[PDB]
Structure formats: C-alpha cells, structure tokens
Amino acid sequence: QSQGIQQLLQAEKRAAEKVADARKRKARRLKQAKEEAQMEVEQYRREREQEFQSKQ
Amino acid sequence: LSDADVQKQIKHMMAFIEQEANEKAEEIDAKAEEEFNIEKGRLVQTQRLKIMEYY
Amino acid sequence: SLAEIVKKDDFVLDSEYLVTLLVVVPKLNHNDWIKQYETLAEMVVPRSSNVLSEDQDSYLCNVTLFKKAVDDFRHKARENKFIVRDFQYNEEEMRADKEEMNRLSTDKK
Numbered sequence: 001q002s003q004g005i006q007q008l009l010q011a012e013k014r015a016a017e018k019v020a021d022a023r024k025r026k027a028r029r030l031k032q033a034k035e036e037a038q039m040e041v042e043q044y045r046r047e048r049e050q051e052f053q054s055k056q
Numbered sequence: 057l058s059d060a061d062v063q064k065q066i067k068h069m070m071a072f073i074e075q076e077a078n079e080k081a082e083e084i085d086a087k088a089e090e091e092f093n094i095e096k097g098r099l100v101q102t103q104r105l106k107i108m109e110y111y
Numbered sequence: 112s113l114a115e116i117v118k119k120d121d122f123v124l125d126s127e128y129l130v131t132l133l134v135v136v137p138k139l140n141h142n143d144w145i146k147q148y149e150t151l152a153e154m155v156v157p158r159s160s161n162v163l164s165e166d167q168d169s170y171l172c173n174v175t176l177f178k179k180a181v182d183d184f185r186h187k188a189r190e191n192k193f194i195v196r197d198f199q200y201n202e203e204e205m206r207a208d209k210e211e212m213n214r215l216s217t218d219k220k
Contacts, residue, residue, distance in 0.1 A: 001158050004156075004158045004159075005158070005159060008070070008129075009124075009125070011070060011073065012073075012125055012127070012128075015073060015074075015077045018077060018081065019077070019080055019081070019084070022080075022081055022084040023084065026084055026087065026088050026092075029088060029092070030088070030092055030095065033092060033096055034095070034096060034099055037096050037099060037100055038099065038103065041100060041103050041104060041107070045107045045111075048111065049111070052111065057145070057146055057149050057150070057157065059157075062149060062150070062157045065150065065152075065153055065154045065155060066154070066156070066157075068153060068154045069129070069154030069156075069177050072128070072154065072177055072179070073128050073177075076128060
C-alpha cells in the first residue's frame, strides 16, 4: 500500500541522490586534479625559466 | 500468494534498479578515469605548448 | 477513449524504471484476477495494481511493472487472453478533450 510504495520511493530517491553526489564529486575531483596538474606544470616551468636565465 | 514470495519479485525488480544504478556509477567512474585523464592531458598539452613556445 | 475512465491515482509517480501497464478485457479469464495481477510479470507489484472499471463481461485495470517489463507484461496479458489497453497516461489530454467537448456543445447551443 502507501507504506510499500514509500519503501521504494526512498530507494528511488537514494538512486537519484547517488548519481547526483557522484556528479558533484566528479566535478570537484576534476577541478582538484586540474589544479594539481597546473601547479606541477607551473613549478616545472618556473624551474626551467630560472635555469634558462642562469644559463643565459 | 503471500508477501514473502511476492517479496521475491519485488527484490528482483529492486536488484534490476540497483544494477542500473551501479551501471551509472561505473559510467561515472569510467568518465572520471578516461575523460578526466583526457581533459588533464589536454590542459597539460596546451599549457606546456604555450610555455615552451614562449620559452 | 477511456480518458476519464482510467483512475489517475493508480499512476506511479517518478515512473523512470517502473511503469503501469493496462491489459485486461474479458471477465471469463478473470477468475484468478487477484493472482494474475499480483504476479503478472516476474517483478510485478502486488499492491499498486488495481482495477478501475468492471464491465458486465470485461474488466479494466492497471498493474505495475518494471521499465523493461513492458513487452513482457504485454505478452503475459496475451497469454492470459487479455486485450491491448495501452493508455499512455494522457491525463493532460483528457482534460483538454473534456474542455473541447464542453466548448462544442456550448458552441452548438
């Protein structure tokens, strides 16, 4: 009846919420990974620039 | 008929729904691996190309 | 056209992976209608399924099933000797049809 339908409405809500949280965490992780890669690239570039200036 | 036996079909349908959700989650993880690596590599290639051209 | 005949209460909200199929006709094969509705398919809901109309020789009902159990429910209805009663839950259309009928009669008057 109503209780049985609600027992599965909760399941459907959880199913949607899992996907929503997965998407949100994926966006956050993409931002974090992009930031980390950019920081590594920037540090490498700064080191290369310092070495290039000294060699110049 | 009885609630227990009908619970069998109910649980089968619930398992179908949960398997669809697990497939969606696996798709999300596959995105976060493959597409995330692709995006990070594209950003790295662009940044490195610009920086090395400037160098 | 059932339109108002179908009961909108039995409709399943957020029917993404689940739906309600209406396949029921002759009452001669409705002797075990309770069990037939409770286990129409391999994952048929026993509670939500319900009958909205009951003719002298036939009955009309909607039984819940999974999203992928549409064709399976249709085949089970055919095996039980039911007739295709696709509805599409045109609740919005039913109101529009009633309004058009009201306008036509008023226009005729």
